[PDB]
mmCIF file of C-alpha atoms in Angstrom:
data_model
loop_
_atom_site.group_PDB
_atom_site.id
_atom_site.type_symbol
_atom_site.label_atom_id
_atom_site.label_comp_id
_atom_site.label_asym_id
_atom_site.label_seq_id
_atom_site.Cartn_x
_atom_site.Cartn_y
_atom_site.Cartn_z
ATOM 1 C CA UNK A 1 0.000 0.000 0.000
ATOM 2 C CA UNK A 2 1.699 3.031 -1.063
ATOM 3 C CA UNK A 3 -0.486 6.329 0.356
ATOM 4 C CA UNK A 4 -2.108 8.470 -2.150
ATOM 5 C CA UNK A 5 -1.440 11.991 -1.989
ATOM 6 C CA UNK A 6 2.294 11.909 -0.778
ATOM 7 C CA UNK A 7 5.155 11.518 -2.457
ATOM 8 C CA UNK A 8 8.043 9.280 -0.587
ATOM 9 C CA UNK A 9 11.319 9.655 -2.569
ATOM 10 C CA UNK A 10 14.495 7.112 -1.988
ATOM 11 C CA UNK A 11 17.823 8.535 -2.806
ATOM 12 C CA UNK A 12 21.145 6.899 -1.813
ATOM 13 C CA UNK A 13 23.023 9.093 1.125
ATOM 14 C CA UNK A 14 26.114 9.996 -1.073
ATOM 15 C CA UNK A 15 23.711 12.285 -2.743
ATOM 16 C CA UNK A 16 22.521 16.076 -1.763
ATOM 17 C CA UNK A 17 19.369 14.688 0.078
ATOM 18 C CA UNK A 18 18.648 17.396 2.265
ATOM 19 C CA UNK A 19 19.008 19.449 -0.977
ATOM 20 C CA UNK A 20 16.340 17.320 -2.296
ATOM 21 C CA UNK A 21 14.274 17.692 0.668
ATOM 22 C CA UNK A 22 14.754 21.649 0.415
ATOM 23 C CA UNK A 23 13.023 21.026 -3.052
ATOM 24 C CA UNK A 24 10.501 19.141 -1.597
ATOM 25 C CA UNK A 25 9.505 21.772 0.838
ATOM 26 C CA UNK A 26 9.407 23.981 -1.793
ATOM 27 C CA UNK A 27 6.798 21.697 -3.592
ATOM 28 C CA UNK A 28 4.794 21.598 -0.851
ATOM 29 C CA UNK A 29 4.950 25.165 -0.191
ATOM 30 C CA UNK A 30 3.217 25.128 -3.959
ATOM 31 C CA UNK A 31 0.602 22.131 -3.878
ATOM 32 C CA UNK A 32 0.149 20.877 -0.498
ATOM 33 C CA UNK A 33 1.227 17.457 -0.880
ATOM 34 C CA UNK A 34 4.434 15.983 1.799
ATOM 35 C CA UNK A 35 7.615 15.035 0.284
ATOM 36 C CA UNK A 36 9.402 12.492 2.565
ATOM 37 C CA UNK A 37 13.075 11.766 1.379
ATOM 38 C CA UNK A 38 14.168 8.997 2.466
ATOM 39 C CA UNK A 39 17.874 7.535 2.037
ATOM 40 C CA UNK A 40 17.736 3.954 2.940
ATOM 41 C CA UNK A 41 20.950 1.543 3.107
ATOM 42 C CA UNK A 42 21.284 -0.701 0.153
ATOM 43 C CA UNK A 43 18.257 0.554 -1.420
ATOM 44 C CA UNK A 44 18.578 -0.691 -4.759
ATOM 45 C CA UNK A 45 18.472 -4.267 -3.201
ATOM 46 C CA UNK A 46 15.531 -2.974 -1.032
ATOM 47 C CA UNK A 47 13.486 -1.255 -4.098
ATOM 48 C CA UNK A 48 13.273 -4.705 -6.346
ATOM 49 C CA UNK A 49 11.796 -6.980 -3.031
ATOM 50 C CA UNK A 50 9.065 -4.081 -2.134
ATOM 51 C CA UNK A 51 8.150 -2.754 -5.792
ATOM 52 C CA UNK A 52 7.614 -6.454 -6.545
ATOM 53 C CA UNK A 53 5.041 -6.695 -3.885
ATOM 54 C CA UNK A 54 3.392 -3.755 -4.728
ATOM 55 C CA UNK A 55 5.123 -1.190 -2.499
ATOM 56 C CA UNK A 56 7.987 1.012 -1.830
ATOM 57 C CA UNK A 57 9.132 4.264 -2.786
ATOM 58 C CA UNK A 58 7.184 6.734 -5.175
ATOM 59 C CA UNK A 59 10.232 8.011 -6.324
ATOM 60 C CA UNK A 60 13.610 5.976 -7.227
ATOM 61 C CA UNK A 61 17.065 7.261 -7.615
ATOM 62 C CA UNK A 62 19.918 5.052 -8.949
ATOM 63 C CA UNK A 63 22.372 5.074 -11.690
ATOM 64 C CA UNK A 64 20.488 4.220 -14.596
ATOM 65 C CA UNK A 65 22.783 1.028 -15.275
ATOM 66 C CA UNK A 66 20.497 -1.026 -12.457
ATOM 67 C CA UNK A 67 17.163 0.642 -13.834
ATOM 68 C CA UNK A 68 17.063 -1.816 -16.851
ATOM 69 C CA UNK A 69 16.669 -4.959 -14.678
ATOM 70 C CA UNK A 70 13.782 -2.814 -12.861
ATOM 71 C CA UNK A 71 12.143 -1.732 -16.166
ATOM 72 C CA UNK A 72 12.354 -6.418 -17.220
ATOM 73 C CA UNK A 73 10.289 -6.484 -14.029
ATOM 74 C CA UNK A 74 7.484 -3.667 -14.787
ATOM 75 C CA UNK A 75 8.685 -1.942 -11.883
ATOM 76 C CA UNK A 76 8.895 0.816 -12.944
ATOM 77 C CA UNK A 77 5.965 3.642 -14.712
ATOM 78 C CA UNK A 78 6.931 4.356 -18.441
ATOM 79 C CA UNK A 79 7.627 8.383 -18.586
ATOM 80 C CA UNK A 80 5.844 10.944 -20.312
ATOM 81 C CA UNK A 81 7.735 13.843 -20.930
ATOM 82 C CA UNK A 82 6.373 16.100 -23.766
ATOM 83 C CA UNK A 83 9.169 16.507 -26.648
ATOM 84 C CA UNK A 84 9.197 20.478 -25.330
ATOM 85 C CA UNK A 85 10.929 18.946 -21.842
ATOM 86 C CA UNK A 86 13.378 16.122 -23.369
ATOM 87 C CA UNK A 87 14.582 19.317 -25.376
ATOM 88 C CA UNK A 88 15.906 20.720 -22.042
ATOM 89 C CA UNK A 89 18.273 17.646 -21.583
ATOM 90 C CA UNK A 90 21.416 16.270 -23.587
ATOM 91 C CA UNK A 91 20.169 13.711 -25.741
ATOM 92 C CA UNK A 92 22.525 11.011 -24.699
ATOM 93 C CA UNK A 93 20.992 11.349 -21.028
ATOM 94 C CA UNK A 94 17.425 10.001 -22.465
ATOM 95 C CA UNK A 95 19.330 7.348 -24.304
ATOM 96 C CA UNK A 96 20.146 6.104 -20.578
ATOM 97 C CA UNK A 97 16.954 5.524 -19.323
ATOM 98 C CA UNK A 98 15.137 4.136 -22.434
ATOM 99 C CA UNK A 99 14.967 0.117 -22.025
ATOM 100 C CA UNK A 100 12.549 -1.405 -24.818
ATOM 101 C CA UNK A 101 12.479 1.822 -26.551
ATOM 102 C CA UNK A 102 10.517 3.452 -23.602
ATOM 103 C CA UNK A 103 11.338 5.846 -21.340
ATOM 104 C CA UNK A 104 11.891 4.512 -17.315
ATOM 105 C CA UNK A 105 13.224 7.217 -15.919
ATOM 106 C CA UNK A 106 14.589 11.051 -15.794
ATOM 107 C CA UNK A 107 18.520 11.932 -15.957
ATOM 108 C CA UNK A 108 19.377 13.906 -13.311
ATOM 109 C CA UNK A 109 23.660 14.077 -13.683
ATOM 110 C CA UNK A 110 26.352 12.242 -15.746
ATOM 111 C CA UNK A 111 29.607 10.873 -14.789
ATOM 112 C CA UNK A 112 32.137 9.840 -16.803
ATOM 113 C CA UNK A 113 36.130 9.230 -16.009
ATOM 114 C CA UNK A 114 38.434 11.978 -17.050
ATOM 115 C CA UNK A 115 41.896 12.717 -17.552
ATOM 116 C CA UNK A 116 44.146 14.611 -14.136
ATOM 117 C CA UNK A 117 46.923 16.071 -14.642
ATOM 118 C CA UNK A 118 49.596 17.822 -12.679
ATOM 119 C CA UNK A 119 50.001 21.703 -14.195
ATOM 120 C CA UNK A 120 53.438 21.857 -12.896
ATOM 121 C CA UNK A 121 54.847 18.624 -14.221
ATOM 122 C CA UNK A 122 52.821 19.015 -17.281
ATOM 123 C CA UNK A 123 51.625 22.541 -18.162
ATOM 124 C CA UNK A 124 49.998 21.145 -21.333
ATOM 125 C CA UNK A 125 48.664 17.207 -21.289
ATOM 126 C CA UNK A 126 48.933 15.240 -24.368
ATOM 127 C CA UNK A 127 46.498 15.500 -26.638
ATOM 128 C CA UNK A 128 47.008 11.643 -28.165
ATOM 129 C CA UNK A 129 47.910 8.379 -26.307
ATOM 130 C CA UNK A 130 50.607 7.672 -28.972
ATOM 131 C CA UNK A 131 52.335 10.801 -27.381
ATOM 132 C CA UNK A 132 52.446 9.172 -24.364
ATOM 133 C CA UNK A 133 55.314 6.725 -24.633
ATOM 134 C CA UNK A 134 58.130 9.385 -25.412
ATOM 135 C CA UNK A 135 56.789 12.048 -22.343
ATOM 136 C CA UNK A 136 57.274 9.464 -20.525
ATOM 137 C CA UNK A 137 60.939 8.382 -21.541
ATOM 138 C CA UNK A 138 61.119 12.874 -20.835
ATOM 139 C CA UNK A 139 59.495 12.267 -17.172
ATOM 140 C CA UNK A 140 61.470 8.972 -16.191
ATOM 141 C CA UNK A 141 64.909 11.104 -16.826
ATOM 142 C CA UNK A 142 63.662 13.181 -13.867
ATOM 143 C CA UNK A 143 62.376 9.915 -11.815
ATOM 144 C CA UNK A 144 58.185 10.957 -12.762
ATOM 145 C CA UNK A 145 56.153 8.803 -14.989
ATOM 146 C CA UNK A 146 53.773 9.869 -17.214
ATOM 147 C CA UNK A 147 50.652 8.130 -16.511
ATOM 148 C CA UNK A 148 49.053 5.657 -14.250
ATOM 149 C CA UNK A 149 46.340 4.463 -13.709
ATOM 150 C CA UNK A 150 43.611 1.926 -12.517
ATOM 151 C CA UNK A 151 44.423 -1.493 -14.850
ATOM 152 C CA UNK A 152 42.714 -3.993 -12.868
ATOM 153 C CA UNK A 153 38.758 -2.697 -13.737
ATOM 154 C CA UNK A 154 37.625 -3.083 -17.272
ATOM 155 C CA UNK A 155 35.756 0.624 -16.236
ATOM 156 C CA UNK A 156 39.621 2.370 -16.150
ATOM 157 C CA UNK A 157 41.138 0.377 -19.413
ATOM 158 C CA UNK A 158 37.967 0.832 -21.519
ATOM 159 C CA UNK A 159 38.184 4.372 -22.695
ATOM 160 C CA UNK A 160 41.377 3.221 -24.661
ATOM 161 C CA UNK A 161 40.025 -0.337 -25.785
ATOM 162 C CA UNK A 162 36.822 1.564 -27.061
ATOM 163 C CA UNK A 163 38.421 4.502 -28.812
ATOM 164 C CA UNK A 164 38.833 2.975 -32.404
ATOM 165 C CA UNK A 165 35.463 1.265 -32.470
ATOM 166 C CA UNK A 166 35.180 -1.147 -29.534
ATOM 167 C CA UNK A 167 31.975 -1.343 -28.364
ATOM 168 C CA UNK A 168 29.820 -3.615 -25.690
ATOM 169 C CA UNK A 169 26.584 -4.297 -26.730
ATOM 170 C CA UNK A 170 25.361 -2.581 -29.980
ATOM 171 C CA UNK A 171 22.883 -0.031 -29.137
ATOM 172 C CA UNK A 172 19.785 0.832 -31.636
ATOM 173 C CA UNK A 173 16.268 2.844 -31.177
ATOM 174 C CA UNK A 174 16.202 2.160 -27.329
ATOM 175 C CA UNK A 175 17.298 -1.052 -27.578
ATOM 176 C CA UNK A 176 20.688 -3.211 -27.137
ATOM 177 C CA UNK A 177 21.656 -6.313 -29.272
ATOM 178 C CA UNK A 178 22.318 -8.343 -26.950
ATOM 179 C CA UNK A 179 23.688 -10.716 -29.447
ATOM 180 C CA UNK A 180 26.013 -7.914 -31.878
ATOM 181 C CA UNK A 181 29.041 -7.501 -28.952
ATOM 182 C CA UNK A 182 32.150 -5.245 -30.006
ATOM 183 C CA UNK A 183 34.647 -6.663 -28.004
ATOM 184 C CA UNK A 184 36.678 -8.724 -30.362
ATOM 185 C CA UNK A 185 37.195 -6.400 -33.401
ATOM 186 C CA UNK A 186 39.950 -4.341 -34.782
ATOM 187 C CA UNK A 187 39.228 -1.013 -32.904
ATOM 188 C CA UNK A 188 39.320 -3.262 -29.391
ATOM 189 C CA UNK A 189 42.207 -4.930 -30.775
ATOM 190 C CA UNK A 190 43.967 -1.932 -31.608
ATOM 191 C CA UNK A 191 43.419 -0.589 -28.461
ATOM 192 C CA UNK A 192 44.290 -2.975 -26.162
ATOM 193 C CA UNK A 193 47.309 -3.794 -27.949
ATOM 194 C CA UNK A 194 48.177 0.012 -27.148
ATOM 195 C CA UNK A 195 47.600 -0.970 -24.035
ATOM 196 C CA UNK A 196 49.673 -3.984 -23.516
ATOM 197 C CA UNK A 197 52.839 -2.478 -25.638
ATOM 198 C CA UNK A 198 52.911 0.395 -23.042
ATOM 199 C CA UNK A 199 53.184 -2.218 -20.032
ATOM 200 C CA UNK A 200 55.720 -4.277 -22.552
ATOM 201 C CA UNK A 201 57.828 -1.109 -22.911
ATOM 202 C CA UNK A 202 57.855 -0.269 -19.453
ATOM 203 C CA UNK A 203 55.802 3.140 -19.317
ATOM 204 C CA UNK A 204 52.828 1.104 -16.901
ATOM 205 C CA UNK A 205 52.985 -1.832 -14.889
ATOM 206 C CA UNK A 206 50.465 -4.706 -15.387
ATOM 207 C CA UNK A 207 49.733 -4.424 -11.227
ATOM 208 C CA UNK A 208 48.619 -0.748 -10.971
ATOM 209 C CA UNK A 209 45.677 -0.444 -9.146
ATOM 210 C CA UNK A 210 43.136 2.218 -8.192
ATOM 211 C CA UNK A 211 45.323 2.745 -4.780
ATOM 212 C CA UNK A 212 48.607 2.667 -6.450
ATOM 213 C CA UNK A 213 47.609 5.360 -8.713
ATOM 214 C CA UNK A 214 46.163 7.530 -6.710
ATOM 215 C CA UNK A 215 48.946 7.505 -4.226
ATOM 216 C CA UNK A 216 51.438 7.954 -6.823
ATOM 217 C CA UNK A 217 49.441 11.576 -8.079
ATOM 218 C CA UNK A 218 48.793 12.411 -4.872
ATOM 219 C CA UNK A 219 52.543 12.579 -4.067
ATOM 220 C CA UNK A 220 53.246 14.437 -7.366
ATOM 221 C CA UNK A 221 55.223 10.486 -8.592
ATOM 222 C CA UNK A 222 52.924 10.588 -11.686
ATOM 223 C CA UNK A 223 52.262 13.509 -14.426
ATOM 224 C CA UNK A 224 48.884 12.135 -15.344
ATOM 225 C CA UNK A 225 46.102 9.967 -13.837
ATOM 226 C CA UNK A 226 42.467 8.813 -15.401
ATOM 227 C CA UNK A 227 39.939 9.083 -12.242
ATOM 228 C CA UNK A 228 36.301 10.092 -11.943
ATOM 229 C CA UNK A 229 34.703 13.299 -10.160
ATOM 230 C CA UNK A 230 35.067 11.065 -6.395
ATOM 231 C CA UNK A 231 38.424 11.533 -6.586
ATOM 232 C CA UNK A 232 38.785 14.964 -6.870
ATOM 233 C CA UNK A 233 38.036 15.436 -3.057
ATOM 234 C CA UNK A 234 41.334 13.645 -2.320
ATOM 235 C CA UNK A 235 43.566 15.220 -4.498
ATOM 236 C CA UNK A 236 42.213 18.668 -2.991
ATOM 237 C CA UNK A 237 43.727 17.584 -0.176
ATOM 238 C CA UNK A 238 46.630 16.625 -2.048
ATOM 239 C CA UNK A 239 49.042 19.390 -2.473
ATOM 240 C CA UNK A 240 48.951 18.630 -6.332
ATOM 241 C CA UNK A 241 47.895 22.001 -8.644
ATOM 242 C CA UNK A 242 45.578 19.910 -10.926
ATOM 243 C CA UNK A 243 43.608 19.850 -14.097
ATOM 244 C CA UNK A 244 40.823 17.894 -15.510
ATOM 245 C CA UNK A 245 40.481 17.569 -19.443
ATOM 246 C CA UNK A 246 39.528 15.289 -22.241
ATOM 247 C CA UNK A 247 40.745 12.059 -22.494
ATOM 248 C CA UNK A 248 43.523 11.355 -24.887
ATOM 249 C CA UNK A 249 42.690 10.597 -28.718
ATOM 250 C CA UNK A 250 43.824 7.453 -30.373
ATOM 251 C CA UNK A 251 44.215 6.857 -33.869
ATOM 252 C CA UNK A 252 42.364 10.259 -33.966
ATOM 253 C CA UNK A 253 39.104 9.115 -32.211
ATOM 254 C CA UNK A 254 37.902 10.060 -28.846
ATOM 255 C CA UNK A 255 38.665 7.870 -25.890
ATOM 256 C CA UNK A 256 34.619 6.387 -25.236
ATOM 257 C CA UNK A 257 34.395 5.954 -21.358
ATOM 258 C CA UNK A 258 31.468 4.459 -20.093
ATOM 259 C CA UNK A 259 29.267 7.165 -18.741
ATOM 260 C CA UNK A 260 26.658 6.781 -15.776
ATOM 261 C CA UNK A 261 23.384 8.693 -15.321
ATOM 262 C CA UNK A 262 21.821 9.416 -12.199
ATOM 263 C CA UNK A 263 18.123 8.596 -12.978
ATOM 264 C CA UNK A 264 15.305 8.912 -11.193
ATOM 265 C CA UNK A 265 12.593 6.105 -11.363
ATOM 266 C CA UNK A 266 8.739 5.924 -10.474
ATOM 267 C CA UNK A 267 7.426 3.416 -9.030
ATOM 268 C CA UNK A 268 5.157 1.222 -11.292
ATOM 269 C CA UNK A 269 2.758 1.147 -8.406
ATOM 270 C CA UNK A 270 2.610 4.725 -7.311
ATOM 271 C CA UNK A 271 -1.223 6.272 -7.387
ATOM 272 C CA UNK A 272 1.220 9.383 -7.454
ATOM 273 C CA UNK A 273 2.344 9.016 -11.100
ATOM 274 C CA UNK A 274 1.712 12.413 -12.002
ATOM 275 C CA UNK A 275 2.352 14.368 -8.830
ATOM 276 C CA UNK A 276 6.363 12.224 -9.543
ATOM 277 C CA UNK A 277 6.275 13.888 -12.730
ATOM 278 C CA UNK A 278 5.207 17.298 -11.901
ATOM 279 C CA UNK A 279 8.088 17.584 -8.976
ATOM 280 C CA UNK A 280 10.597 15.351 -11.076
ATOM 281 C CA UNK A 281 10.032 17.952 -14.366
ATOM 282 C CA UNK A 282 8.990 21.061 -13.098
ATOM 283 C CA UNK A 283 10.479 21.343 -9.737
ATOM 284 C CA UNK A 284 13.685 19.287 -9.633
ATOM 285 C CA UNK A 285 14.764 19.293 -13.040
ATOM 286 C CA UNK A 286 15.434 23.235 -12.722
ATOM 287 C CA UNK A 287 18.207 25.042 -12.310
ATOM 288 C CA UNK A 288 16.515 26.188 -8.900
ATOM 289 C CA UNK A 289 16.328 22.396 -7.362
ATOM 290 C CA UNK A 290 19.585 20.825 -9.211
ATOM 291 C CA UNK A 291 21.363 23.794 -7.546
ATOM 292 C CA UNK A 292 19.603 23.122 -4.465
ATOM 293 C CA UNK A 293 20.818 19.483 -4.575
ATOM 294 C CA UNK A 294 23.844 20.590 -5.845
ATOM 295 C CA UNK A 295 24.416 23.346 -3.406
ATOM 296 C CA UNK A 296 24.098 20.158 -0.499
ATOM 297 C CA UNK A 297 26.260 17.841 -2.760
ATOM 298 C CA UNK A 298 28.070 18.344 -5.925
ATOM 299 C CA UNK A 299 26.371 16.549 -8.536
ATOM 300 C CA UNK A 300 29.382 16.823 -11.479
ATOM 301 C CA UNK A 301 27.660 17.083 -14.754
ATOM 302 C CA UNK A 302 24.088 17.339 -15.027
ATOM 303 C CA UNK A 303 21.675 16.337 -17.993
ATOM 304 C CA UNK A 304 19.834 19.748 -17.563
ATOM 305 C CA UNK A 305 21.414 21.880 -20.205
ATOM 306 C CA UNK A 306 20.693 25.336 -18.938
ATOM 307 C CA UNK A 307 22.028 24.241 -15.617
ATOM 308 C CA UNK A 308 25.006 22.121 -16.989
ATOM 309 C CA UNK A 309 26.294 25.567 -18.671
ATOM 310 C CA UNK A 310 26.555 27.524 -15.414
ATOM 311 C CA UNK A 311 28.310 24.214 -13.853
ATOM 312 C CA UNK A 312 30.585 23.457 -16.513
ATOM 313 C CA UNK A 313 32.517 27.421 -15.648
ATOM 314 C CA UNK A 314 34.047 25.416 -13.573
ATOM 315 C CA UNK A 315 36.949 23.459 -16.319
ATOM 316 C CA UNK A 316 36.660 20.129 -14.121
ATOM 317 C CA UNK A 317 33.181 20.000 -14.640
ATOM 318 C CA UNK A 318 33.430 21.135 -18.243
ATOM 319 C CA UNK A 319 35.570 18.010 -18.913
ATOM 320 C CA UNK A 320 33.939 15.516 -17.453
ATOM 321 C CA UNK A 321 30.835 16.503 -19.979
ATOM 322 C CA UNK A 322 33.015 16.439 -22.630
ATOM 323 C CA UNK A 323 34.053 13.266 -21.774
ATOM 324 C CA UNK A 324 30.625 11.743 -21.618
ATOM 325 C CA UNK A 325 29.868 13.703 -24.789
ATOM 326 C CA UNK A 326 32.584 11.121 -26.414
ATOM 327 C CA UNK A 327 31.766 8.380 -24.464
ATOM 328 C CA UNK A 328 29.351 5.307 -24.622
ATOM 329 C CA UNK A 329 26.442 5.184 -22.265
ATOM 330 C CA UNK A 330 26.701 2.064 -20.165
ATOM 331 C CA UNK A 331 24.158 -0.613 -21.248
ATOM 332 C CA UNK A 332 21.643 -1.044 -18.686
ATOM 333 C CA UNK A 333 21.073 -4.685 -19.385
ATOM 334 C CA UNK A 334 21.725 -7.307 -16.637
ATOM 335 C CA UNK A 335 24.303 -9.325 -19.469
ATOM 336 C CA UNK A 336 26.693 -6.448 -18.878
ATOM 337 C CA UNK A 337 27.462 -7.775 -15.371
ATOM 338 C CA UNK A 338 28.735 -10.839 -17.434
ATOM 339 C CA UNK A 339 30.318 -8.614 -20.535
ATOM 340 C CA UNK A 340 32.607 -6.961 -17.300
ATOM 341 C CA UNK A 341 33.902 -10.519 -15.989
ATOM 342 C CA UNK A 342 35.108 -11.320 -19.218
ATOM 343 C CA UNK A 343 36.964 -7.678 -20.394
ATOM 344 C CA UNK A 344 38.071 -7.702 -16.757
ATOM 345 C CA UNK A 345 40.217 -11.364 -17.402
ATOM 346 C CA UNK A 346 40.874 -10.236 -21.214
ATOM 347 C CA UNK A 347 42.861 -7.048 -20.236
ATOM 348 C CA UNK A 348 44.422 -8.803 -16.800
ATOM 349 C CA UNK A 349 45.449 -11.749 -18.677
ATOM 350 C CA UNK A 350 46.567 -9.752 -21.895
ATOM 351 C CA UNK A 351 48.622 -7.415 -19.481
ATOM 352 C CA UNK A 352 50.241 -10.500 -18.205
ATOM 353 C CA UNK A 353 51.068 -11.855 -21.706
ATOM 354 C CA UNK A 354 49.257 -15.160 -20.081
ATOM 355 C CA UNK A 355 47.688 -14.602 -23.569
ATOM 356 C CA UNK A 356 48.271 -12.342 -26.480
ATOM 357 C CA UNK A 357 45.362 -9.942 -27.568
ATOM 358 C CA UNK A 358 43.774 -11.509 -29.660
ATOM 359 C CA UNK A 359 43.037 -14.667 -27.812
ATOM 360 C CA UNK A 360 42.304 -12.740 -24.601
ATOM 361 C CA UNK A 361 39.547 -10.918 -26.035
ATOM 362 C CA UNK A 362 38.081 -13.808 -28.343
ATOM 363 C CA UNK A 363 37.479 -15.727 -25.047
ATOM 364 C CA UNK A 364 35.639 -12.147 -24.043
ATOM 365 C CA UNK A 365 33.378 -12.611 -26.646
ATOM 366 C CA UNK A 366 33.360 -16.835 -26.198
#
């Protein structure tokens, strides 16, 4: 039994939720109707067990990646947004939420992994990965590296493997082919071979993981580093004098990270369908309540366009859109959670030399 008349919104506690709340209010002030924000632990495990029974939140927030096994369920209400509001947001956001060519949900803010830098190592980062190699034969003459980075999850390497036309599930009108996977062609191949010749020429070491790396930019070891927005916190901290930008080209295309959406879901069984909408579109969805959210916690990016402009003065923020501008929304299908086992052994066992490649990533795409 969900109650009529009230809207009860989940929202995990990493998030601005009192800035959500201060939107809330605000609704209420306007129609009358409580907003309860709630931010309940492990509530994307919670949300599938009560929205199957009938119950649970009005409102859902998640990244959009988990949103697609909700939508196979019926979980969640199939949006309505008239073509004058999906205007207001990037395209690629609405591309996150669709599942069956419907919409399930609104974009709220993107992430996507960017390239750091250290301005007084490197007053101007490379522009190319095949660049990358001889700055850091320059660096190692001074005992600094060029670059390092997360190798041990697929989410770090990808950018690279994806650049010349690797891809994880083909994506048309809404809807993924689950059966068309781009693992195991010559843009992938290209890539990771990239990848594997710098740990073969000794500019990155096979073992580098996301603790490694940080540590080493944090202490000024490392010229370069390829983190998300979370990590910016620590290098604040840091005494580092850092810069965020795009991702380096190879073979002239874009590095494609994988980008996340922060989506927010109703409830299949809501009676409060449209009152979701009206505060999801109308008050949320403005530059008013994102910077309320924002103002609580720092969202990054944000799908709202008019919003996303005044965010993006800041260059970190500016980059990380970018980024997801070039980048490849992650599928939202449950078959990805199998599509990163395998990468994750292809790139591991190809930075090894357990097995060259090509084999690695055939046995990616069995």
């Amino acid at each position: 039994k969900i109650e009529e008349g009230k809207l009860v919104i989940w929202i995990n506690g990493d998030h601005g939720y009192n800035g959500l709340a201060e939107v809330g209010k605000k609704f209420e002030k306007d129609t009358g109707i409580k907003v309860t924000v709630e931010h309940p632990d492990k509530l994307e495990e919670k949300f599938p067990q009560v929205a199957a029974t009938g119950d649970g939140p009005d409102i859902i927030f998640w990244a959009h990646d988990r949103f697609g096994g909700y939508a196979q369920s019926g979980l969640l209400a199939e949006i309505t947004p008239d073509k004058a509001f999906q205007d207001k947001l990037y395209p690629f956001t609405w591309d996150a939420v669709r599942y069956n060519g419907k919409l399930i949900a609104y974009p709220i803010a993107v992430h996507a992994l960017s390239l750091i830098y250290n301005k007084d190592l490197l007053p101007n980062p490379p522009k190319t990965w095949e660049e990358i190699p001889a700055l850091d034969k320059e660096l190692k003459a001074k005992g600094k590296s060029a670059l390092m980075f997360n190798l041990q999850e697929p989410y770090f390497t990808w950018p690279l493997i994806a650049a010349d036309g690797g891809y994880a599930f083909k994506y048309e009108n809404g809807k993924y082919d689950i059966k068309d996977v781009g693992v195991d062609n010559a843009g992938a191949k290209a890539g990771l071979t990239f990848l594997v010749d710098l740990i073969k020429n000794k500019h990155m070491n096979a073992d580098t993981d996301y603790s490694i790396a940080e540590a080493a930019f944090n202490k000024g070891e490392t010229a370069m580093t390829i983190n998300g927005p979370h990590a910016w916190s620590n290098i604040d901290t840091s005494k580092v004098n850092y810069g965020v930008t795009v991702l380096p080209t190879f073979k002239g295309q874009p590095s494609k990270p994988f980008v996340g959406v922060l989506s927010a879901g109703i409830n299949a069984a809501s009676p409060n369908k449209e009152l979701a909408k009206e505060f999801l579109e109308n008050y949320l969805l403005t530059d008013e309540g994102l910077e309320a959210v924002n103002k609580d916690k720092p969202l990054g990016a944000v799908a709202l366009k008019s919003y996303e402009e005044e965010l993006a003065k800041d260059p970190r923020i500016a980059a990380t859109m970018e980024n997801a501008q070039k980048g490849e929304i992650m599928p939202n299908i449950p078959q990805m959670s199998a599509f990163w086992y395998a990468v994750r052994t292809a790139v591991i066992n190809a930075a090894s030399g357990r097995q060259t490649v090509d084999e690695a990533l055939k046995d990616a795409q069995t």
